[PDB]
Amino acid sequence: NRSLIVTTILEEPYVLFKKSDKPLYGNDRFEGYCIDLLRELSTILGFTYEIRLVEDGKYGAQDDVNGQWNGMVRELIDHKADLAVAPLAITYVREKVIDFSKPFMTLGISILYRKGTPIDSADDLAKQTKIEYGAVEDGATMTFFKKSKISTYDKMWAFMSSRRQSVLVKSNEEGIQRVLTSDYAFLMESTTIEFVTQRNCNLTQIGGLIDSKGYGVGTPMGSPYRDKITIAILQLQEEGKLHMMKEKWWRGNGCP
Amino acid sequence: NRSLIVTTILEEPYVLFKKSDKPLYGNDRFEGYCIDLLRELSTILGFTYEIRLVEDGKYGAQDDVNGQWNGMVRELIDHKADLAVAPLAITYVREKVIDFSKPFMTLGISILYRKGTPIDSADDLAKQTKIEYGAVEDGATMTFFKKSKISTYDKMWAFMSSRRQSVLVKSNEEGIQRVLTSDYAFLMESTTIEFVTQRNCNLTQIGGLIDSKGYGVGTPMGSPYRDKITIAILQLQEEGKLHMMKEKWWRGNGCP
Ligand SMILES: N[C@@H](C[C@@H](C/C=C/c1ccc(/N=N/c2ccccc2)cc1)C(=O)O)C(=O)O
Ligand SMILES: [Cl-]
């Protein structure tokens, strides 16, 4: 029964500040899917924890000049947190430097856009330059296009790469706003798209999932929590609890 | 330098004997998704191997009286195999006794039924009695329904259980043939449903995934290969190689 430090990041509906008229204290300031998941994990494993929002505000990417990591990944590497419980994508490059639990949610990159247009796939966007499109700078989604040898997606990356300053945004809050107020398609993880489209009733996911990945709890390399967390996740999945938590948090405010 | 012993089991289209007019020897006698996966893994990690078909023809379950395991899971526990490369579901009870890689495929229980009807979900079946529905008796799909506390799945279990002589079958093939000839829906893994619907143009999956689980490569607890194989699988996913393999082994002769 250690007391752990858990790093996480603000992103609805995984983690948000709980609405209140007066200051809330400590872990009580937060709510969301990942907050509920962290509570269920602590019940099973028997630990208390302090939630600390990641200090530099980032998920985790590697500086290609100096090799250094940032974000929640770096916090784990440096043993500044015990666990990262967030919508943090399990990717090849990250799994090499930290230990992820098995996934608690499965998803893929897709496209956020306006409802009734001729666009129907990544190919449709890749073909033309008239409708702009991008992703959040330095997330797994942007990293995917940058590294992809796949035809359409190297082509999409050229468009993005040569327009880094315009089409790449700094957050999801900013991407969504750009979709809503300009002619722009936002490349984004499908779970987040599904939350957005149950709120902004004039937006939609375009096409299928472009790839496949999961979110996992991050731990430092070698951590004894990693396997215990994987086993607790499997228990919660088999009890129906992960599904119930997803329904709780994605229950859109009634989108006609 | 030591070759690995890989336990597996015959299961279409994951592992089958290859039909060929040309002489085949040893491992080359097998083909399938899991064989292609093993070959990619051995190229990436640089190991040689011998494929062996599991002695008791089982994936792996624990005896409810004496606590002993069988199947491929037992071969890993006893250190008789280094890897199990098969569509072995990553479950809580198994993950406690062996080390699974991360999933190479993610799936769930779903519903096989004919096209063209107003039936659109599990709930549509649950609240009627005209259309019969069932599953393989004593299979993982049945286990789910029996333990679920969800209202819809509870009704479904009560129906299937009480009507077991009428609606449960001994094999997927008996259930599929029944969907084709009679007013009957069949519950099984979505991977199997996809294989079927690619070959039976008059059939479809109804609704989405009822639960969520992954197939993973098994290794003995503590194996140094587990994390390596995880990292190779993530590389293959990101390169689009696992998607290409899935398409190769699942695609049928096309349907309008
Ligand atoms: N979930 C993905 C990240 C996800 C999208 C969002 C990435 C993102 C990256 C950095 C980020 N940073 N926000 C701040 C905010 C304030 C200060 C510094 C940074 C905000 C969002 C994606 O679709 O790629 C991952 O795990 O990398
Ligand atoms: Cl793992």
Which amino acid would we find at residue A107?
L
Ligand nearest to the CA of B229: 2
Q: B148 — phi, psi (to 5°)?
A: -60, 140
- Distance CA(B32)–CA(B38), nearest Å, equals 10
For chain B, give every domain's residue range: 1-107+213-256, 108-212
Distance B87 CA to ligand 2 centre (A): 16
Strand order across the beta sheet in which A218-220 lies: A48-53, A3-8, A83-84, A218-220, A98-100
Residues of chain B neighbouring A209 (CB-CB closer than 8 A): none
Nearest to B97 by CA among B214, B207, B11, B221: B221
Resolution (angstroms) equals 2.0
What is the CA A21 to chain-centroid distance, rounded?
A: 29
The answer to whether residues A79 and A210 touch, using CB atoms and an 8 Å cutoff, is no
Nearest to B191 by CA among B248, B121, B110, B114: B110
Topology annotation, domain A108-212: D-Maltodextrin-Binding Protein; domain 2 (3.40.190)
Domains B1-107+213-256 and B108-212 share a fold: yes
Say whether residue B182 is in contact with chain A using an 8 A CB cutoff: no
Experimentally determined by: X-ray
- Distance CA(B41)–CA(A61), nearest Å, equals 26
A36 lines ligand 1 (CB under 6 A): no
- Distance CA(B219)–CA(B112), nearest Å, equals 33
**Residue in A95, A144, A227 nearest the CB of B230:** A95
Q: Which ligand 1 atom is the nearest neighbour of the CA of A144?
A: 24
Say whether residue A191 is in contact with chain B using an 8 A CB cutoff: no
- Distance CA(A192)–CA(A200), nearest Å, equals 12
Selected residue of A98, A237, A242, A245 to mutate for chain B interface (largest B Cβ count, 10 A): A237
Q: Give the C-alpha distances (Å, rounded to integers) separating A235 from A6, A142, B85, B213.
A: 21, 33, 23, 11
Which amino acid would we find at residue B244?
M
B235 to chain A, closest Cα gap in Å: 6
Distance B39 CA to ligand 1 centre (A): 36
Max CA pair span of chain B: 61
Selected residue of B101, B102, B156, B239 to mutate for chain A interface (largest A Cβ count, 10 A): B102
- Written out in words, the top-level CATH class of the domain with range B1-107+213-256 is alpha beta
**Residue in B95, B238, B243 nearest the CB of A91:** B238
**Residue in A227, A234, A235 nearest the CB of B90:** A234
